[PDB]
DNA sequence: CAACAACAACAACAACAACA
């Protein structure tokens, strides 16, 4: 995977500066390479010449130049995709949930976003030949609606051992936006040691509705949301982990629209809209995607996770 | 239960600051740890560095990091469930009413929400081996429809002493939304000294239909409801008290929909829909739940509380 | 019982604000302690700080905290119930007509709601040891069907002097919904001087059928009805009077359903359904009650008021 | 009795506004006092402040406050009742037809409804000494069965002059369920210009069966009937006149009055007429807040209505 | 094409000076000619007389005097335009995308900016008689939204060799504003060696929203944006490449406006506004242009790229 | 017109001195007369006595003493004014664009300053009886926004031949502030040979925004702008040509302010402010003028140049 | 004494009989 920051120690860099970078949140040389000069200067005790030298030596460790489109196509041909637990949804997504990007599913209440998140979290531990990502998973839950019983049910359905799928899922709760960002920081610190494949944030904008209320607090809310989404995107680009976030809806009074403004719209790569059907059936539609045609699919949440409709 | 806020005094914090935090609403380390920096800053006489130290020591007191899913499963397997008073409904709920969450029962009038609330209030004092929670009950009532006669009848049915049942139930009445929020603040203040198991708000969204009228003040109504539900969620996560709220319905002109909107749709954890059949028989259906299948059950309200329908 | 606004003057407030509140409609410290901040702010000439100050002093005047259920039981056991003039109906209601809660009686035409209202108005003047409270009565009549000869007949049946029986009965006909609300305002203003025990509104929703017509203005009609019922409930709670209202019915076109929608259903406390029987006899059924079991009784209307059927 | 609306002109309201109100239909201060603010707003050119000011002044004009049951008892004892021409029916109703209220008479066809209406119309001209309010009658006839010959017969029976009896009877006919409302609107000016003691509608619900048909037009029919009955009640309460209306009957698949709950709840007194043997009929009180449920016997003689000749 | 800077060497200037100028970014005589004195002085190792001599030779090599308008008209008539992929859009721009200038397309999310950029990138390699520019395309992408599949689809639609169109497209990703600005130096370095006819930046102002947050950082953000746009304009004037930049949108909040401010408004030459209508159809409008009227052409994005709407 | 510098030689001045003056930038006797002693002594090879003789002879050639105000009034009535292409705007300016003075237009983007400049450039060549200046015109453009198509359209509107009108719009482009300033020397050199009546510069302060950045470079920027404006004023007073300049705008975060500071405010004589109205209609408001009062006017840029608004 | 823009969100209200 990514080269740890210890390599920078072998480039004429003092140990205390490396420790300062590590405690600032840059646990990988990729983070320092992608860091602008302002971020590397805002940390106290760092001089302009020191930051210039650090960036100069970090630029040699990772390629940041011009490459032909054929090389990019070859690189994209090795992108792992994780099955969503339904054959129809897998066909609709043309492979499944993509890694290295942000895919957000939004809809009304009880539509089935959390069930999909649970099924993805338990599925990503599967071997690659079976459609998994062959890695652990993380769940930063903000609504307190994490139920390991569903994970056990899906593990029983797929035949895996429940103990292992339980032991290979990190969990955390967010009580406020600041705690959410600190959880992202701790996830960045932790991910450098083991192999992670999924990172679920359900839901990303639940706490922003209550913490930032009113009109005069709109700009600060948008700035904080933008910083959070930028951190998520940086983590996805660095560690190559599939980031799945959940979004709510709001009324179109005088008819529902996803919340979060233009920041969430321009920060996501794939967007899915989930809507209610009849009894236990739900409909998924590709709201926005750079290479996926606008289509629809039908699914249902059975007693063993998400799957195809029992028609 | 939660550690009292006085422990913060043993972490180099002035007594007057702790008194200010207590008068602001925070009476435990958990409440302070769950609050963002904005809320603490909003208190007058509090500096930025002092607040940062306060949250630092609060986070040191109570863990907030990542834990394996098996630890969460072990924690969840030791959660008390309060019997609803009916065996069929107990089977439907897979244990009864769960603590630490929000259960909202809604339906038309005459369905039996108040009777269910009364039965839960009386039976939450039972020993754990009988399905109780072994704690005092609270009743914040807004419609002026609290009758101790039903509590006496259920106490006679289960055989406990009526005097102790009446003595171990706190009651209060709400005349407007502001008084409802102040009652919640007083409940937070008084819950830290004794052990409480249930907290009933019937109805949660009854006054909001009258105080806020018209399209002009819809946003203010939604914001106030969101703040009230956030306070309820904070109380539930703090003291581990089973919160039961009651909701009404509205007619779908051009056919009944629960009032409150997306705020109460997303704030609640478990939702039950109660409908009227014939005679004294009623039908309860699980509307929204993260780990409970959509099913139905039949019950009735006899002379001694809610129970199974006579066949 | 109620404490006039004058007591606020000795608590720090001046006289101009007291006069302004009296103009607004609050003639009691209880009535001003039951109002939200937005209601007092709407009175022009009152500042936010002044409103907070007066609300704090009013909350200091009357208790609004948490009380044990045993205290509520003691308070509830000392309320007065007024007999309806029939032994069967008195047994059915387990005491008669309560005070402090809304009792709605509905049925088809010719059924006999107005006779019951007249008999209750006469009985409202009986000594407390004979079946009724000790106070005067009112009659807001919106159909022009107030017949004093029935009052004289019932007073002769029980045995009283007709002069003071008729003297202690207010009356005011209503010609429109706005006039009805202004009549309620005048009743609230005038109730503080003397002792009142019955507030009859017959019919409560008779003018709403004609004043508001069509689907377009249904929401405004419902909002106005909700405001009227909220004012009625506030008056009943503040002055401790027995409010009795009458309601009409409509045919359930593909069979009688009371009019008023969910507002009247959720605003009332005791609902009775009166139905024509055979000849002169009628049957009264408990439609809805939080503590009275669903039963029915048999009665009639003789030449001297309502009473038990003669067999 | 009623105070002309011109008074409102003198207290600070433009004459144009008073003329507009008179055009709308409010010919009396009482008429504009009994109307809600919403109704007054619907008139174009009337502002919120102007409507509030005129409503407040009108409320200052009329005593809309709270009274005592003794005063209402004195007011009730000061009303007049009009004899129906039969002693049995006179004693059945404890007098006659009370003014300021609505009396609906219904039954099967050919049961002496129009005969009773004619006798009541001719009786209201009597001096108070022998019943009647000493006024003039109005006949809004919808069925077309108004014969100006029974009136002469009853006038001859009572000894009154025929020409004066026939002179003061304002007759009009309605052809659909839109001319009735316009006739009622026009009746306000005639009632404010001269004393009127009886308004007769026969039948109240006759054209509604044919103009409105099917389930689709049921709601509109009920709304229009409610508006018509509300206007009738407003006129009765305003001008202190007695309204007598005639209602048809419908079979049951066993006869019940038509009109639904609207006419049942909008009528104060209800009488049911049934046929017996020969030329004898029975009148029974259906719904009444004070009169007990009883029956009386009456016959339609060759001269007028009255007690049966036995 | 542009004359390489080596022609200066045989003009009286030292080769070391030419190398020093080369490392600064001036790889062409045109770049040195279009340079103020301070720009050529701030580079170390350059004297005043030496800079004056270099500027004198640069002015001698490149004509900078007045010219009759007919010659400019002829030169404008010899300007190549790149087919946009739609016939009505080609009619809208009176040809295609102009070369030697800056065109900026902006709109809300999922409106078709990236699809248009991809279609232009593949179309630029067409022979000059089919509307192409007969060169190579460069793609600087700042959102990770480059998909070679769309390029392959459009190449198959136009009957090209997919391998060649993949081999003749250069790609780069910008992880921060500094990297985005520094990519242009490499772009200029690699543009002289071969023939390039299209440079796409998508998006130009995406990273400035998050990197430069708050209010105190507004002036620095505007200065950096101005420098970046000036460098883009210098590239366009130097190598005669069609520069296509992408711009986002922002809400007004007491209704959407492009971001960037007056700098982007005045720097760009042609401005296009793209909006979404119904289904798969979009509307394109001309916002700012010196010689094109305000029209509202209409198009769509099918599986083979941009194209005409299907009725 | 102005007397050429070929008159000081036949007065006792060596031809070498005249050649030196011509090289320095002074091509007419008036330019040397207006040159102060400090400016002329800066020329290499010029002594104090030679300079004194030169200024003495120049002052002898052209009068510089006091003139009675009626002579100035007579000379003021012999000033040509150029029509702006709109009759209403011509009425607003009371004749048109005055010669021998500096006019400035500023506004937001797409407001229509370049269109007005093009219309003035093409109409300047009209005969005097039609409102033209009878002379040629020039165009020093900095943004590369010169489009001969608009000139051809207006020439078609006025009926003049396209080739003849194109052959007299000698145009140049400025790539930096130094080049923009040095273009004026060539403009003065070519102005003495033919008849010119326009010196359009669009825009004057475009390059100064990016060439000079930061607070440290403010004083040098202001000094250079002052020198450029002084050269423009000297040219206008020398050759009697109408100088028209275009100014950008900036926002007011603490709302539009023309850029350039007090130097351009105190240098320009007539300042007009252009604003965007609705659709194709624009509003022109006179900002600053010592002769005409503040007023507003309406115009529109149709498909064939600027003109009156379409009604 | 000069110069620099940006940020969305919130649901609710029932009613009308008739035909051998
Ligand atoms: N064991 C189960 N078997 C079948 N269906 C289930 C089961 N558990 C939950 N469900 C279904 O899950 C649905 C709700 O899904 P989920 O909790 O994921 O909603 P969500 O919209 O993502 O939640 P939220 O927005 O409130 O966070 C319910 O309608 C219910 O039918
Ligand atoms: N002692 C009793 N015995 C039997 N049934 C009873 C008794 N007391 C109340 N009920 C029943 O309670 C029912 C009403 O239920 P409940 O009082 O809980 O109201 P609810 O549906 O919660 O309505 P709301 O709170 O909106 O007024 C009635 O139908 C009545 O039959
Ligand atoms: N003096 C009396 N003696 C006996 N019965 C009487 C007497 N007065 C009225 N009634 C009875 O009253 C009954 C009607 O009751 P009431 O006047 O209270 O009507 P209501 O249905 O409440 O009125 P509404 O629906 O029109 O508002 C009639 O059936 C009649 O028999
Ligand atoms: N001159 C008369 N002498 C005796 N009886 C008469 C005379 N004129 C009419 N009648 C009687 O009048 C009765 C009909 O009464 P009336 O004309 O009032 O009908 P109605 O019940 O009002 O019916 P409709 O529904 O047609 O209005 C007949 O039975 C007839 O015997
Ligand atoms: N293969 C495809 N077939 C049809 N339409 C497609 C296909 N791929 C993407 N789309 C369409 O592309 C649209 C989004 O356009 P695009 O990807 O160019 O985004 P954009 O608005 O320019 O945003 P951004 O700059 O954030 O990428 C979607 O609405 C979708 O309908
Ligand atoms: K939920
Ligand atoms: K000036
Ligand atoms: Mg969920
Ligand atoms: Mg209840
Ligand atoms: Mg009644
Ligand atoms: Mg008739
Ligand atoms: Mg894009
Ligand atoms: Mg321009």
Residue numbers in the entry:
A (entry chain G), B (entry chain E), C (entry chain C), E (entry chain I), F (entry chain K): 21 to 274, 283 to 339
D (entry chain A): 21 to 273, 283 to 339
What did the paper state?
The central protein in HR is the RAD51 recombinase. RAD51 forms a nucleoprotein filament with single-stranded DNA (ssDNA) generated from enzymatic end resection at the DSB site. One emergent RAD51 modulator is RAD51AP1 (RAD51 associated protein 1), a protein that directly binds to RAD51 (15) and promotes its activities in HR, thus contributing to the maintenance of genome stability. Our studies reveal that RAD51AP1 acts as a RAD51 modulator via strengthening protomer–protomer interactions, promoting RAD51 oligomerization and reordering its DNA binding sites, thereby facilitating filament nucleation, stabilization, and strand exchange.
Since the ATPase activity of RAD51 plays a key role in HR and RAD51’s ATPase activity is inhibited by Ca2+ (37), we optimized conditions including DNA sequences, RAD51 to DNA ratios, and salt concentrations that allow sufficiently stable RAD51-ssDNA filament formation in the presence of Mg2+ instead of Ca2+. We refined two distinct 3D reconstructions to 3.6 and 3.3 Å resolution. The two filaments have a rise of 18.5 Å and 16.4 Å, respectively, and a corresponding helical twist of 52.9° and 55.1°, yielding respective helical pitches of 126 Å (6.8 protomers per turn) and 107 Å (6.5 protomers per turn). Detailed inspections of the two reconstructions revealed that the filament with a shorter pitch has Mg2+-ATP bound while the one with a larger pitch has Mg2+-ADP bound, suggesting that in our samples, some ATP has been hydrolyzed, resulting in ADP-bound filaments. The ATP-bound structure is similar to those obtained using Mg2+-AMP-PNP or Ca2+-ATP, validating the use of nonhydrolyzable conditions for structural studies of RAD51-ssDNA filaments. The ssDNA is organized into stacked triplets intercalated by the conserved L1 and L2 loops of RAD51, specifically R235 of L1 and V273 of L2. Further, the β-hairpin and the α-helix within the L2 region are also involved in DNA binding. In the ATP-bound structure, the γ-phosphate helps to coordinate the H294 side chain at the end of the small α-helix of L2. Our Mg2+-ATP bound RAD51-ssDNA filament displayed a slightly more relaxed filament (107 Å and 6.5 protomers per turn). The ATP-bound filament has been shown to form on presynaptic (ss) and postsynaptic (ds) DNA in a similar fashion, with DNA stretched between B-form nucleotide triplets, the ATP bound RAD51-ssDNA is therefore ready for pairing with complementary strand.
